[PDB]
């Protein structure tokens, strides 16, 4: 064979060039940095009203409005200051794993096993919330809807591919292929020109939203990657897998930066998020808890101990004043 | 109170939304959630049609004042089982496999690993599983084709229709690793009338009664 040999030798030489030039891991340089102590975060508000397993949650751009998706087919918009339910949206599909807040606060796009991203308009003229546009074209379950603009959103699926849409037309503008497993999560960059997606093939990769190239690939996990999110400066990202490990990769180094695993940790990470400064890497785990790792030292510098079930979703306000954690115990808790 | 004239109306709207949420959750908790599972080419488009009537396929029907929601599996193509944990707390699992399953070629490996997967999952081990063998048009004409040594070397004895069915049910009982909590409901009928719906209704009635008894501490 020739092409298989060519691919193997290209992979080997890229890996050799990557190793021979890499100086030292993130910990080797950042060990001199003092720790942050223990992040003791207390539940200031508990949001009640969801009557099923809570799977998704996304903060508003004003750091006061929240959207939460539960199993009973409910997408609730909360006022995070007074626990006032601003809105309650009965979803068409009760099996939702993701949904987000539009950056202008006008729309919410949400979906799951239906393979359809349904987008509802909030600032209407009739005082209710109506379905604006349903994006279809995926052949597998949906994940990590993330608005780019009011007419443009990227969604991941289990088709080993991601899609960039155009809401007015409703047609799939761009398709990013190259994964070899169920893609579980994507995060949008702060500059809204690149993104990353991690799949069940224990690999993540950085994709260009404009021209649709497979810009970079990233491996190092042993099992399915369930969550992913950028560093707030859009030059790095973190994944959480079923290997009971979080891994920080860098978008310019082309391999793993460092790892956030512990011996006592046996269950996988299902949600991941960053604080506003990119110092506290918060991970909602499978057992019961949320661990506040120091994204520089990989130390368990805080545990959010509520949530009698598994913490399924995390969120940080755009101002960073609070952390929303949602679990299968049918409750969000807002922590500060 | 300290609330302004507008925040009082906002609180009133939020309380009305609370009222609607609990009112609809009362109906949502009074609905029977059934998962539907099966191996490749096992047959799922023949029992959902018997019910009283893309990604996930939802079938809704009311039987004897019970609202059943059934969630199908034939709309997915990825078998990574990342969506099974979404089906925790369902009433029961209707799993479908046919006696003619070793025609597409072997019935042991893929089907029995699917069973052991749903019998090993932490989320499903406390949920009862319903087993169906419905039709009676081809389950007899391929037993007498040849001795099963070609793909079933575990048994080398007498083989009639009833004996083979009983042996398959017994080996299924052997597949169940823990009978302390989960209960298997196998069914051997004719796919001719609405007996499958009555059987699943009785199975869910019994499992709900047993959950009630465990909740009361009587079981």
């Amino acid at each position: 064979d020739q092409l298989r040999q060519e691919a193997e030798q290209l992979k080997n030489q890229i890996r050799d060039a990557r190793k021979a030039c890499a100086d030292a891991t993130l910990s080797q340089i950042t060990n001199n940095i003092d720790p942050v102590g223990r992040i003791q975060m207390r539940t200031r508000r508990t949001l009640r009203g969801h009557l099923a397993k809570i799977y998704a949650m996304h903060w508003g751009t004003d750091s006061r409005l929240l959207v939460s998706a539960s199993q009973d087919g409910k997408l609730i918009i909360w006022d995070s200051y007074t626990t006032n339910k601003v809105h309650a949206i009965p979803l068409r599909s009760s099996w939702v794993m993701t949904c987000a807040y539009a950056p202008s606060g006008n729309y919410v796009a949400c979906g799951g096993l239906d393979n359809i991203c349904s987008i509802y308009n909030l600032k209407t003229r009739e005082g209710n919330v109506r379905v604006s546009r349903e994006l279809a074209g995926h052949t597998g379950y949906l994940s990590c809807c993330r608005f780019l603009d009011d007419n443009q959103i990227v969604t991941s699926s289990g088709d080993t591919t991601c899609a960039l849409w155009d809401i007015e037309t409703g047609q799939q503008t761009t398709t990013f292929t190259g994964h070899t497993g169920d893609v579980m999560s994507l995060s949008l960059a702060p500059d809204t020109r690149l993104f990353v997606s991690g799949a069940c093939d224990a690999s993540a990769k950085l994709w260009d939203v404009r021209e649709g190239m497979c810009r970079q690939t990233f491996t190092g996990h042993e099992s399915d990657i369930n969550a992913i999110c950028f560093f707030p400066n859009g030059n790095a990202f973190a994944t959480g897998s079923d290997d009971a490990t979080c891994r920080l990769f860098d978008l310019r180094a082309d391999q793993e930066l460092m790892t956030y695993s512990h011996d006592n940790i046996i269950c996988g990470i299902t949600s991941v998020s960053f604080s506003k400064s990119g110092r506290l890497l918060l991970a909602g785990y499978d057992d019961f808890n949320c661990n506040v790792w120091d994204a520089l030292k990989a130390d368990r510098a805080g545990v959010l101990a509520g949530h009698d079930n598994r913490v399924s979703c995390l969120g940080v306000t755009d101002d960073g004043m609070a952390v929303a954690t949602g679990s299968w115990d049918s409750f969000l808790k807002i922590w500060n | 109170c300290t609330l302004s004239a507008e925040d009082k109306a906002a609180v009133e709207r939020s309380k009305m939304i609370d009222r609607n949420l609990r009112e609809d959750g009362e109906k949502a908790a009074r609905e029977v959630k059934l998962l539907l599972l099966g191996a490749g080419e096992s047959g799922k488009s023949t029992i959902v049609k018997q019910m009283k009537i893309t990604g996930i396929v939802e079938t809704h029907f009311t039987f004897k004042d019970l609202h059943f929601k059934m969630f199908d599996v034939g709309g997915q193509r990825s078998e990574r089982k990342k969506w099974i944990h979404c089906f925790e707390g369902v009433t029961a699992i209707i799993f479908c496999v046919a006696l003619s399953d070793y025609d597409l070629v072997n019935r042991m490996h893929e089907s029995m690993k699917l069973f052991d997967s749903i019998c090993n999952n932490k989320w499903f081990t406390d949920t009862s599983i319903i087993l169906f063998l419905n039709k009676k048009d081809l389950f007899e004409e391929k037993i007498k084709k040849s001795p099963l040594t070609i793909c079933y070397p575990e048994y080398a004895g007498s083989n009639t229709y009833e004996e083979a069915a009983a042996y398959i049910q017994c080996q299924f009982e052997d597949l169940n690793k823990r009978k302390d909590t989960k209960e298997i409901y196998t069914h051997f009928t004719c796919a001719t009338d609405t007996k499958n719906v009555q059987f699943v209704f009785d199975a869910v009635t019994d499992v709900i009664i047993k959950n009630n008894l465990k909740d009361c501490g009587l079981f």
Partner: single-chain antibody, 232 residues
Framework: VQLVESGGGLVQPGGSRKLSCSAS????????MHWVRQAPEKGLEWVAY????????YYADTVKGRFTISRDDPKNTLFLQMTSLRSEDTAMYYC??????????????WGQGTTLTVSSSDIVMTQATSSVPVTPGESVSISCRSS???????????LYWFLQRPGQSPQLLIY???NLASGVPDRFSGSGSGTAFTLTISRLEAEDVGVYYC?????????FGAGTKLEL
């Protein structure tokens, strides 16, 4: 969105009347409803309010105990029943919708109004002028003052700026302090502090003339201003 009123006419003193408000074009069951009145060539005056679901009902202390409010959400109708009418009940009656949550516009739409004729503590809002001549293209600043500070502890300022064109019904221009309405040109703006509030208009247009009103919500009963009429 269309609110239409009916039930007006001429009535003898001591009689009882009923006004009906029918809505079509929005979610009536999710909107609280206000009944407002305007005395002939004198000014606006709030009359009554009913919350969503008929939970909270408020009346104006001037005619408190004499009027009553009824509501039908499944039929989308708002009723105002009047028991005994003096020589003051003659007025032009308006029906207003009001939804209340974080960030809403609770006075956006007004009704068409109906005429009623009869045969023969509270916050006070002060409006500086009543007739101002001006030509198009000139920026106009209107000012009005309040008794107490509209600034609540939340940070919200409960001031509503409405415009009434001649022959038309009032329309919201600003709902809390400086927040533009839906479908209104973006040349209007509002600013001020505490008790002194100004509405500024840049690049004045021909159809912008009319009577401007500033009202406080903040509390009950709701009170309107005198009314500043722009001349041209």
């Amino acid at each position: 969105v269309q609110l239409v009123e009916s039930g007006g006419g001429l009535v003898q003193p001591g009689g009882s009347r009923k006004l009906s408000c029918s809505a079509s074009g929005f979610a009536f069951s999710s909107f609280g409803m206000h009944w407002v009145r305007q005395a002939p060539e004198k000014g606006l005056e709030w009359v009554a309010y009913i919350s969503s679901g008929s939970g909270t009902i408020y009346y104006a202390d001037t005619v408190k105990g004499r009027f009553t409010i009824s509501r039908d959400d499944p039929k989308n109708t708002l009723f105002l029943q009047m028991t005994s009418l003096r020589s003051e009940d003659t007025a032009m009656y308006y029906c207003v919708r009001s939804i209340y949550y974080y960030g809403s516009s609770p006075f956006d739409f007004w009704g068409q109004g109906t005429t009623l004729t009869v045969s023969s503590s509270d916050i006070v809002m002060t409006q500086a002028t009543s007739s101002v001549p001006v030509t198009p293209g000139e920026s106009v600043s209107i000012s009005c003052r309040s008794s107490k500070s509209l600034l609540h502890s939340n940070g919200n300022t409960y001031l509503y700026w409405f415009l009434q064109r001649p022959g038309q019904s009032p329309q919201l221009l600003i709902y809390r302090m400086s927040n533009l309405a839906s479908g209104v040109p973006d040349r209007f703006s509002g600013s001020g502090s505490g008790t002194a509030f100004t509405l500024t208009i840049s690049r004045l247009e021909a159809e912008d003339v009319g009577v401007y009103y500033c009202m406080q919500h903040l509390e009950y009963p709701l009170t309107f201003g005198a009314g500043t009429k722009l001349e041209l």
